[PDB]
Amino acid sequence: SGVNNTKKWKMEFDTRERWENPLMGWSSTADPLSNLVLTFSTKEDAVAFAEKNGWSFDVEERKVPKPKSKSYGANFSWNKRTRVSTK
Amino acid sequence: EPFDNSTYRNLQHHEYSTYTFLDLNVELSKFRMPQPSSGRQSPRH
Cβ atoms of A41 and A9 within 8 Å: the answer is yes
Q: What are phi and psi of A82, to 5 degrees?
A: -70, -10
What is the DSSP annotation of A5-71? TSSSEEEEPPP--EEE-TTT--EEE--TTSS-EEEESSHHHHHHHHHHTT----------PPP----
Spatial distance between the Cα atoms of A49 and A33, rounded to a whole number of angstroms: 16
This structure was determined by cryo-EM
Residue type, B3: F
DSSP state of B19: T
Q: Which of A77, A79, A86 is the best mutation test for B, with the most CBs of B within 10 A? A: A79
Q: Looking at CA atoms only, how far is residue A71 from chain B in angstroms? A: 17
Residue type, B13: H
A32-61 b/e with 16+ CB inside 10 Å = b? eebeeeeebeeeeebbeebeeeeeeeeeee
